[PDB]
Ligand binder design. Structure first.
Ligand SMILES: *[C@@H]1O[C@H](CO)[C@@H](O[C@@H]2O[C@H](CO)[C@@H](O)[C@H](O)[C@H]2NC(C)=O)[C@H](O)[C@H]1NC(C)=O
Ligand SMILES: *[C@@H]1O[C@H](CO)[C@@H](O[C@@H]2O[C@H](CO)[C@@H](O)[C@H](O)[C@H]2NC(C)=O)[C@H](O)[C@H]1NC(C)=O
Ligand SMILES: *[C@@H]1O[C@H](CO)[C@@H](O[C@@H]2O[C@H](CO)[C@@H](O)[C@H](O)[C@H]2NC(C)=O)[C@H](O)[C@H]1NC(C)=O
Ligand SMILES: *[C@@H]1O[C@H](CO)[C@@H](O[C@@H]2O[C@H](CO)[C@@H](O)[C@H](O)[C@H]2NC(C)=O)[C@H](O)[C@H]1NC(C)=O
Lengths: 107, 89
């Protein structure tokens, strides 16, 4: 509706018999390939990303937001769980590190 | 072509329009909505459908747990269009 790309904002400018909009839009660039999977099997449970996708640079799995590659480790506070993982097609095994276990193991 | 009346041919031939729609369809199937924003970035179609379920408010696990059923519904729904077009005048 307002420029090609995801709309950030826009400014009006007066023209003789009309109006000229300057549409400021965000255009993603410099894309990179990654291997992906819908869920993660861990301890017999399927973990799906809260917001983002599971991406692997070949040998290590991460969660990223869909529009800017900013990788973060798969953890229990940014992935939710839904049943076991016999129904999903495309599951990959990996560890979902939880942040409470290191603190409790320090005891 | 009778007396002074002429019908000019459209600039885009029917084949060119078919090619436009084929391009749009391949883009939306393979890359989701990324190609409209800019460079076409490809996602597996299941994961893209999960994106879209998140869009409508349903969580993404609902698609993956029910992917076969959703596929069957979509296929049969497309099949119904052929009957509707071919038979209904
Ligand atoms: C992601 O990977 C695909 C497949 O490897 C790349 O597509 C191919 O890239 C090569 C080299 O640029 C071309 O010669 C092929 O014609 C491409 N298409 C194929 C093999 O079907 C794609 O370029 C990669 N994306 C990025 C951003 O690197
Ligand atoms: C894939 O990404 C992971 C990110 O963890 C890489 O693993 C780490 O890479 C850094 C930088 O080379 C090393 O310092 C670490 O020792 C690596 N391991 C860990 C557990 O952090 C991995 O090298 C990447 N693989 C490829 C092929 O790019
Ligand atoms: C993605 O596609 C590949 C296709 O290679 C699937 O891997 C198997 O590949 C062999 C190659 O001969 C095929 O005969 C099999 O039919 C493929 N398996 C399946 C289940 O189709 C791979 O499994 C596919 N991944 C997902 C998540 O469906
Ligand atoms: C992820 O881990 C599970 C758990 O072991 C694997 O499931 C095993 O699959 C083998 C081969 O099909 C069976 O012999 C085992 O009995 C299965 N274990 C269980 C507990 O059911 C699964 O194969 C792993 N994923 C991959 C891609 O290898």
């Amino acid at each position: 509706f307002c420029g090609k790309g995801y709309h950030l904002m826009s400014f009006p400018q007066s023209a003789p018999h009309g109006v000229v909009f300057l549409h400021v839009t965000y255009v993603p660039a410099q894309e990179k390939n990654f291997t992906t999977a819908p869920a993660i099997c861990h301890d017999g449970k399927a973990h799906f990303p809260r917001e983002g996708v599971f991406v692997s640079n070949g040998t290590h799995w991460f969660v990223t937001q869909r529009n800017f590659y900013e990788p973060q480790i798969i953890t229990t506070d940014n992935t939710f769980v839904s049943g076991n993982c016999d129904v999903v097609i495309g599951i990959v095994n990996n560890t979902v590190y939880d942040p409470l276990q290191p603190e409790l193991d320090s005891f | 072509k009778f007396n002074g009346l002429t019908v000019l041919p459209p600039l885009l031939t029917d084949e060119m329009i078919a090619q436009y729609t084929s391009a749009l369809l391949a883009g939306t199937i393979t890359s989701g909505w990324t190609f409209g924003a800019g460079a076409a970035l490809q996602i597996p179609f299941a994961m893209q459908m999960a994106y879209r379920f998140n869009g409508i408010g349903v969580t993404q696990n609902v698609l993956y747990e029910n992917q076969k059923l959703i596929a069957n519904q979509f296929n049969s729904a497309i099949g119904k269009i052929q009957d509707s077009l071919s038979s209904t005048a």
